[PDB]
Amino acid sequence: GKVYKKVELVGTSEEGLEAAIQAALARARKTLRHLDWFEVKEIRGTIGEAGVKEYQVVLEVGFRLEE
Amino acid sequence: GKVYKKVELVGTSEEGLEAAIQAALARARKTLRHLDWFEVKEIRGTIGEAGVKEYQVVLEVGFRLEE
Amino acid sequence: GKVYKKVELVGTSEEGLEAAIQAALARARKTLRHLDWFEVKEIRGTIGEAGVKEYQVVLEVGFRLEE
Amino acid sequence: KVYKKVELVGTSEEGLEAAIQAALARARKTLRHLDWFEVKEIRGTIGEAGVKEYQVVLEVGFRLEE
Amino acid sequence: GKVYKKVELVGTSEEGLEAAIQAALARARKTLRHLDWFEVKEIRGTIGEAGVKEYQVVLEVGFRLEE
Amino acid sequence: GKVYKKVELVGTSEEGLEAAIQAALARARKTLRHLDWFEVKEIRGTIGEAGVKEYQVVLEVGFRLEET
Amino acid sequence: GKVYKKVELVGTSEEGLEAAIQAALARARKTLRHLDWFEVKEIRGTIGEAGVKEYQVVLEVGFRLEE
Amino acid sequence: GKVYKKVELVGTSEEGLEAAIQAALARARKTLRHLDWFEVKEIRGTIGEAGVKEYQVVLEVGFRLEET
Amino acid sequence: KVYKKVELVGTSEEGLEAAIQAALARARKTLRHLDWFEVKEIRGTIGEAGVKEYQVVLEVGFRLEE
Amino acid sequence: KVYKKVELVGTSEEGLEAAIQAALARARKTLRHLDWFEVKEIRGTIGEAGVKEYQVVLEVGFRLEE
Amino acid sequence: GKVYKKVELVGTSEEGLEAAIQAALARARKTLRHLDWFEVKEIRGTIGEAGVKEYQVVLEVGFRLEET
Amino acid sequence: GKVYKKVELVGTSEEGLEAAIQAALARARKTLRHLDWFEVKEIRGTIGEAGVKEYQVVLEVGFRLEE
Ligand SMILES: Cc1cc2nc3c(=O)[nH]c(=O)nc-3n(C[C@H](O)[C@H](O)[C@H](O)COP(=O)(O)OP(=O)(O)OC[C@H]3O[C@@H](n4cnc5c(N)ncnc54)[C@H](O)[C@@H]3O)c2cc1C
Ligand SMILES: Cc1cc2nc3c(=O)[nH]c(=O)nc-3n(C[C@H](O)[C@H](O)[C@H](O)COP(=O)(O)OP(=O)(O)OC[C@H]3O[C@@H](n4cnc5c(N)ncnc54)[C@H](O)[C@@H]3O)c2cc1C
Ligand SMILES: Cc1cc2nc3c(=O)[nH]c(=O)nc-3n(C[C@H](O)[C@H](O)[C@H](O)COP(=O)(O)OP(=O)(O)OC[C@H]3O[C@@H](n4cnc5c(N)ncnc54)[C@H](O)[C@@H]3O)c2cc1C
Ligand SMILES: Cc1cc2nc3c(=O)[nH]c(=O)nc-3n(C[C@H](O)[C@H](O)[C@H](O)COP(=O)(O)OP(=O)(O)OC[C@H]3O[C@@H](n4cnc5c(N)ncnc54)[C@H](O)[C@@H]3O)c2cc1C
Ligand SMILES: Cc1cc2nc3c(=O)[nH]c(=O)nc-3n(C[C@H](O)[C@H](O)[C@H](O)COP(=O)(O)OP(=O)(O)OC[C@H]3O[C@@H](n4cnc5c(N)ncnc54)[C@H](O)[C@@H]3O)c2cc1C
Ligand SMILES: Cc1cc2nc3c(=O)[nH]c(=O)nc-3n(C[C@H](O)[C@H](O)[C@H](O)COP(=O)(O)OP(=O)(O)OC[C@H]3O[C@@H](n4cnc5c(N)ncnc54)[C@H](O)[C@@H]3O)c2cc1C
Ligand SMILES: Cc1cc2nc3c(=O)[nH]c(=O)nc-3n(C[C@H](O)[C@H](O)[C@H](O)COP(=O)(O)OP(=O)(O)OC[C@H]3O[C@@H](n4cnc5c(N)ncnc54)[C@H](O)[C@@H]3O)c2cc1C
Ligand SMILES: Cc1cc2nc3c(=O)[nH]c(=O)nc-3n(C[C@H](O)[C@H](O)[C@H](O)COP(=O)(O)OP(=O)(O)OC[C@H]3O[C@@H](n4cnc5c(N)ncnc54)[C@H](O)[C@@H]3O)c2cc1C
Ligand SMILES: Cc1cc2nc3c(=O)[nH]c(=O)nc-3n(C[C@H](O)[C@H](O)[C@H](O)COP(=O)(O)OP(=O)(O)OC[C@H]3O[C@@H](n4cnc5c(N)ncnc54)[C@H](O)[C@@H]3O)c2cc1C
Ligand SMILES: Cc1cc2nc3c(=O)[nH]c(=O)nc-3n(C[C@H](O)[C@H](O)[C@H](O)COP(=O)(O)OP(=O)(O)OC[C@H]3O[C@@H](n4cnc5c(N)ncnc54)[C@H](O)[C@@H]3O)c2cc1C
Ligand SMILES: Cc1cc2nc3c(=O)[nH]c(=O)nc-3n(C[C@H](O)[C@H](O)[C@H](O)COP(=O)(O)OP(=O)(O)OC[C@H]3O[C@@H](n4cnc5c(N)ncnc54)[C@H](O)[C@@H]3O)c2cc1C
Ligand SMILES: Cc1cc2nc3c(=O)[nH]c(=O)nc-3n(C[C@H](O)[C@H](O)[C@H](O)COP(=O)(O)OP(=O)(O)OC[C@H]3O[C@@H](n4cnc5c(N)ncnc54)[C@H](O)[C@@H]3O)c2cc1C
Ligand SMILES: [K+]
Ligand SMILES: [K+]
Ligand SMILES: [K+]
Ligand SMILES: [K+]
């Protein structure tokens, strides 16, 4: 039947988790078609003078392949 | 001693992670008593024209059983 | 063929590990029939003035579903 | 929407798909809005002729009424 | 020495597990050369009116990279 | 009380998953006694010109050991 | 070369996940130097009349050791 | 240097966890040499009319192999 | 509130509970506000009479002073 | 910034580091802004003289162009 | 079809990781046949006055079993 | 009986894996007594102009606690 592919991306944001996820999805849309779902694999980040410097959300993005 | 039960629910929200968690907990309260804690097992979601379509947070909800 | 169900319970006891497991199984028997096996998922607990206060054993209890 | 996941173990002497079908058929007896499943484990018992009973442990997700 | 690459695909089929796996490998062959092995990561699916609707097998496909 | 042992085998077959599992169990039967249960640890395989070449199912086979 | 140490902390907040993470990082800065990165290990929490009572984020905080 | 081997056994006992572990170690001693350490992999069991029927502790037993 | 988790390995020739008690007793010597523990691993050494030393690896959580 | 992670398996008859270097060298052929790697698995093949080929499965992270 | 078996061994060496892996494979060769692949499960070791004393690599060794 | 403690360190080195492990153990010895064993949790690193820049080995170091 249909076949999907999953790519692993890492979105980042200085503001929050949702923002980091949205950033990765927005970049994905630039070159990928038929984006369907995502799975968060890891949540990490860097530390700076303001506490969190960058939130880094590692996720798998699943999209349908064309035939 | 006391015995607790853990049920697995999936809360969803178009707005964010916390909202999805709160949605699952609110639904849990409708039929379950003595809700005590929760554990997030997975964070995933669907993708749409606005990026994230639905955030889906899979969690275990622990509550005390009556004797 | 036959179908079984697994429920997740957390047995607790101030006596010890075995007692915590037994507490969960005793409560399970109150509303579940055809209890067959259990699987320990986690062993944890609270700390008191002189050591372990309450042992908490998270387990899955498997039982056969009726007709 | 809020979904719930229950854990069932389907069994069958025939094969993996049959074991999964057995669990879903029983789920349907009392659960509405069945949507997806996830296989957690595949195991089974052994007899003189090899596999006696195939056992598929799965999580079944369904939408809760609101 | 040689270097291989692994891509993550989700093969789907309404026929069964093997068919889902075969669907993923058939699509992989369309754009990937020197396909060598696969590893199943997850088996899941959707539910229909009378049982499994679509089987979905998440797998990693390993292939040798060219010069 | 009783003690069981678990051996890890990889059954293979060009036919399918069930056939691969059965191949491992058939082999275990040649030199082991009291085979009771199995647990699938991994499912993988090789690829050929027609898709799956060989299905490979990694499993643990549990059997009862004879009493002292 | 350089050597880092990782400590496990649990930040809490009644308001959200990011707030809980920031709380742990702020406490870490009180006694630790050279804070560099963090990794979320678990997200859980307590339940109250308002739904979530306390969000609890378990994280590893990595920092460089001095020589 | 030295090489060790690990075997997987499931000790059982109606008495408790420690007893189940001891049962597996006692059995390992019958045919193995240089038993050094063990690691509990899983704790499970069967259920009877009075709660736990049989405790089952799955463990890996590590032992030293004789030098070449 | 902010908590910290440390990893200790309690040991005892007696049993699992005794091993856990040993780790908690040592934790109490230098750590305040001990609240909970989580068993990470259960292992041990072997002697001529079976278990020599039971070893319980656990994480101990305690509240940090503010 | 947004990064991407690809999974490669480097191999070498020499050792672990050489296997890792092999994967990174191939990655560099088509991927820009290579930043970090994570070893997922270490395995290999066996021959008459022991290890034939060391195989290191790793994830390679790189920054995507914006 | 064909069936393989996997044994778990811990190779050790004061020299390094590769040497530890090689030690386990050399030992496996003494009593096993058709050794085909290995998988590292864990890397650990002991500590001495000069840092690492003994490297210990836990691995699974897969080999083909003879046909029925 | 005896009680041991495990600390998590990340040894780094531009020389190789063993060197990274040795760096962590050398630093550990500076403030920890009765060092006994170590367990590798992760192997990772940074990438430079011609390959691995810095190897980073995350490990747990176990040592015996004193009276
Ligand atoms: C392994 C697996 C895991 C899954 N996990 C989840 C989960 O966690 N939650 C969940 O709710 N569902 C999940 N799904 C279901 C998934 O999100 C889809 O609903 C399902 O796979 C059906 O997809 P499709 O065939 O319609 O693909 P689609 O890609 O939806 O099919 C064509 C559609 O693509 C749209 N499209 C075209 N260009 C683009 C573009 N550039 N970007 C985006 N869309 C575009 C078109 O408008 C068209 O309607 C999962 C599926 C699989 C296989
Ligand atoms: C395996 C396990 C994991 C845990 N993990 C955590 C954790 O991550 N974080 C943490 O802080 N604690 C955790 N706990 C502790 C837990 O949250 C409780 O504080 C503890 O178990 C004591 O619960 P209880 O017996 O007071 O139950 P309770 O259910 O609190 O006992 C009775 C109480 O129920 C209340 N109640 C009645 N009806 C309802 C209702 N409909 N909804 C809600 N409450 C109602 C009553 O007002 C009454 O005070 C965990 C406990 C276990 C066993
Ligand atoms: C995924 C899976 C994992 C398993 N893991 C293990 C394991 O770790 N260890 C192990 O040893 N086995 C394990 N088993 C086997 C299991 O424990 C059973 O032996 C097996 O599933 C067969 O169960 P059954 O059909 O006989 O069920 P049963 O529940 O034994 O069938 C009905 C029985 O229930 C009794 N019963 C029900 N309610 C009552 C009551 N109120 N009062 C008195 N009697 C009552 C009846 O008298 C009757 O004999 C596992 C099975 C599966 C499917
Ligand atoms: C955590 C999570 C993981 C997911 N994983 C996957 C995945 O792996 N693959 C994938 O493809 N999708 C996956 N999904 C998506 C899922 O399959 C659904 O498509 C999605 O959740 C939307 O469901 P719904 O609200 O339409 O529910 P539905 O349950 O579809 O809504 C009501 C439907 O129930 C039917 N119904 C109720 N009772 C009966 C009955 N007795 N007999 C027949 N029909 C009946 C009605 O006819 C009606 O159409 C996932 C979703 C979540 C939240
Ligand atoms: C990390 C890892 C894990 C592995 N896991 C397994 C496992 O689970 N099971 C197992 O059995 N093996 C496994 N292997 C082994 C693997 O399957 C290969 O046998 C091994 O890597 C050697 O591959 P190769 O260099 O011969 O590649 P190949 O891809 O076999 O080399 C080139 C071949 O590709 C053919 N080819 C390419 N494109 C086409 C085309 N379009 N039409 C026709 N022919 C074409 C050529 O004719 C040529 O013979 C694994 C290997 C690694 C590195
Ligand atoms: C850790 C653990 C996990 C388990 N998981 C499961 C599970 O997933 N599912 C489940 O249903 N049960 C499971 N069990 C239960 C198991 O399958 C047994 O039913 C139970 O342990 C009782 O075994 P026994 O003492 O009767 O052993 P045995 O005496 O070995 O039982 C009789 C068995 O011996 C075999 N046998 C007899 N003679 C021979 C011979 N000459 N050659 C080869 N075989 C022979 C028979 O075919 C039969 O299966 C589990 C048990 C344990 C301890
Ligand atoms: C195992 C591992 C995992 C990693 N994971 C990630 C990741 O997920 N994401 C990522 O982006 N990077 C990650 N890194 C990289 C990490 O964040 C650093 O960028 C890198 O390790 C270099 O650190 P450093 O030597 O400069 O240390 P630094 O501590 O940055 O070196 C000295 C610096 O400390 C500053 N400093 C002094 N006092 C304090 C204080 N009290 N609090 C804070 N800073 C102070 C000084 O101003 C000075 O510039 C990881 C590194 C390792 C080893
Ligand atoms: C991967 C790994 C993990 C480890 N994990 C742990 C751990 O969790 N905890 C820990 O404390 N140590 C652990 N160890 C250390 C281990 O227990 C040994 O102390 C160490 O490996 C040194 O062993 P050895 O070379 O002295 O072996 P051996 O020569 O096997 O040591 C002497 C042992 O032989 C036994 N023995 C002698 N004759 C016989 C006989 N005739 N029949 C049966 N047994 C006999 C003795 O009872 C004694 O235990 C681990 C080692 C490795 C490699
Ligand atoms: C990530 C996480 C996981 C959790 N998991 C669980 C779980 O599995 N089970 C569960 O039941 N709960 C669990 N909890 C809840 C936990 O046990 C506490 O109930 C909760 O964190 C609230 O702690 P507190 O702020 O009251 O701290 P406390 O430390 O209880 O506050 C101060 C207390 O310290 C005592 N104290 C300080 N020094 C000493 C001393 N030397 N001797 C004696 N007493 C002393 C004081 O008497 C005082 O009562 C968890 C919490 C978190 C954050
Ligand atoms: C999820 C995650 C995990 C991480 N884990 C770790 C970790 O384990 N350890 C750690 O230390 N850090 C880790 N990091 C941090 C990482 O290594 C980077 O330091 C960080 O992501 C910042 O990268 P950058 O934006 O500067 O990208 P860069 O790619 O460094 O930015 C552009 C650079 O690319 C170079 N470049 C491009 N093409 C070529 C070419 N062909 N040849 C040579 N140079 C070229 C340019 O010269 C330029 O300097 C992690 C980061 C994330 C997001
Ligand atoms: C679950 C699984 C995982 C795998 N993972 C990998 C992987 O990670 N990487 C990879 O490259 N391949 C992997 N393989 C492939 C594997 O290494 C084999 O290439 C493949 O299974 C084919 O084996 P065979 O049937 O030729 O066996 P065999 O007949 O065993 O193959 C010949 C082998 O026998 C050995 N041999 C012959 N005579 C002797 C003797 N007298 N003493 C000792 N040894 C002798 C040779 O040295 C040679 O290696 C995997 C296979 C499976 C089933
Ligand atoms: C959970 C667990 C896991 C284990 N895993 C392994 C494993 O993977 N491999 C393995 O082989 N073993 C393993 N072990 C065994 C471990 O390495 C020890 O051999 C065992 O715990 C016994 O330790 P001990 O009590 O002798 O401690 P020790 O620390 O050996 O006791 C005190 C010793 O420290 C020395 N010392 C302290 N500071 C200094 C100093 N500054 N200068 C000189 N000497 C100093 C003293 O001279 C004295 O001999 C494990 C043990 C446990 C509990
Ligand atoms: K958030
Ligand atoms: K099948
Ligand atoms: K006990
Ligand atoms: K090395």
Q: Indicate the DSSP class of residue D24.
A: H
Cβ-based interface (< 8 Å): residues of H facing F: 7-14, 19-20, 23-24, 26-27, 30, 54, 58
What per-residue string of b and e applies to E15-36 under the rule 16 or more CB within 10 Å gives b?
A: ebbbebbbbbbebbbeebeebe
E17, two tokens: 């597990």
Determine if residue J33 is left, alpha or beta; phi over 0 gives left, psi from -120 to 50 gives alpha, anything else beta: left
Query: What's the CATH fold of domain F1-68?
Result: Dodecin subunit-like (3.30.1660)
For ligand 15, a single-atom ion, which residues have Cβ within 5 Å? C 17; H 17; I 16
Smallest CA-to-CA distance from F21 within F5, F3, F9, F34 is with F9
C36, two tokens: 């067959």
Kindly state the helix (H) or strand (E) to which residue I21 belongs, with its residue range.
Answer: helix I16-30
Q: Which residues lie closer than 8 Å to F31 by C-beta, 6 or more apart?
A: none
Whether K10 and H1 lie within 8 Å, measured CB to CB: no
Cα C43 from Cα C58, distance rounded (Å): 6
CA-proximal residue: ligand 7, atom 24 (nearest): G64
CA distances from A16 to C58, E45, J21 (A): 33, 32, 35
Strands (E), B1-67: 3-13, 35-48, 51-64
Q: Indicate the DSSP class of residue J58.
A: E
CA distances from D9 to B35, C39, C65, D18, G51 (A): 27, 14, 10, 12, 32
J3, two tokens: 């990064």
- DSSP, collapsed to helix, strand or coil, labels residue B66 as coil
F28, two tokens: 């275990």
J46, two tokens: 């066996």
Backbone angles phi, psi at I13, to 5 degrees: -85, -15
Contacts of E58 in chain D (CB under 8 A): none
- DSSP, collapsed to helix, strand or coil, labels residue J50 as strand
Instruction: Answer for the pair E13, E23: CB distance below 8 angstroms, yes or no.
Output: yes
Q: Which residues lie closer than 8 Å to E31 by C-beta, 6 or more apart?
A: none
Cα K60 from Cα K51, distance rounded (Å): 27
Cα K3 from Cα K64, distance rounded (Å): 6
**C-alpha count within 13 angstroms, C-beta hemisphere, residue F42:** 12
- DSSP, collapsed to helix, strand or coil, labels residue E2 as coil
Q: Indicate the DSSP class of residue K65.
A: P
Resolution in angstrom units: 1.5
- The CATH number assigned to the domain with range I1-66 reads 3.30.1660.10
Closest in D17, D24, D39 to E47, CB measured: D24
Cα D64 from Cα A55, distance rounded (Å): 33
Smallest CA-to-CA distance from H16 within I53, F63, I16 is with I16
User: Chain K closest CA to J55's CA: distance in Å?
Assistant: 9
Q: If you search the block for the tokens 């007709």, which residue do you land on? A: C67
Our measurement of the distance from residue G30's CA atom to the centroid of its chain's CA atoms, rounded to an integer in Å, reads: 13
CA distances from J11 to C57, D58, J16, J19, L47 (A): 44, 37, 8, 4, 18
| DSSP calls for F21-68 | HHHHHHHHHHH---EEEEEEEEEEEEEETTEEEEEEEEEEEEEEPPP-
C57, two tokens: 């054993």
For chain E, domain boundaries: 1-67
Q: Is the dihedral of CA J14, J19, J24, J25 positive or negative?
A: positive
State if residue H20 touches ligand 3 by the CB under 6 angstroms criterion.
no
User: Chain J closest CA to A9's CA: distance in Å?
Assistant: 4
Beta bridge partners of I53: none
Smallest CA-to-CA distance from E10 within F53, A63, B54 is with A63
Cα D59 from Cα D57, distance rounded (Å): 7
Cα E61 from Cα E6, distance rounded (Å): 5
Position J19: which residue type? A
Cα G37 from Cα A52, distance rounded (Å): 9
Cβ-based interface (< 8 Å): residues of K facing L: 16-17, 42-47, 51-52, 55
Our measurement of the distance from residue J8's CA atom to the centroid of its chain's CA atoms, rounded to an integer in Å, reads: 5
| Burial (0-12, 13-18, 19+ Cβ within 10 Å), B50 | exposed
Cα G62 from Cα G60, distance rounded (Å): 6
Method: X-ray
Q: Ligand 3 pocket check: which of D13, D16, D43 to mutate, most ligand atoms within 8 Å of Cβ?
A: D43
Nearest CA in chain C to D56: C3
Q: Indicate the DSSP class of residue B49.
A: T
Strands (E), chain E: 3-13, 35-47, 52-64
Position G46: which residue type? T
CA distances from H5 to B43, C36, I25, K40, L67 (A): 40, 34, 35, 14, 35
E56, two tokens: 């979905």
**C-alpha count within 13 angstroms, C-beta hemisphere, residue C44:** 14
Kindly state the helix (H) or strand (E) to which residue G60 belongs, with its residue range.
Answer: strand G51-64
Cα D10 from Cα C8, distance rounded (Å): 18
Instruction: Answer for the pair B34, B63: CB distance below 8 angstroms, yes or no.
Output: yes
Q: Indicate the DSSP class of residue G35.
A: E
Question: Which superfamily is assigned to C1-67 in CATH?
Answer: Flavin-binding protein dodecin (3.30.1660.10)
Q: Is the dihedral of CA D19, D23, D29, D34 positive or negative?
A: negative
Query: To probe the interface with G, which of L13, L27, L52 has the most G CB atoms within 10 Å?
Result: L27
Beta bridge partners of J23: none
**C-alpha count within 13 angstroms, C-beta hemisphere, residue K19:** 10
Cα G10 from Cα G38, distance rounded (Å): 12
Q: Which residues lie closer than 8 Å to L62 by C-beta, 6 or more apart?
A: I9, L4, L5, L6, L35, L36, L37, L38, L39
Helix, strand, coil content of chain C in percent (nearest 5): 20, 60, 20
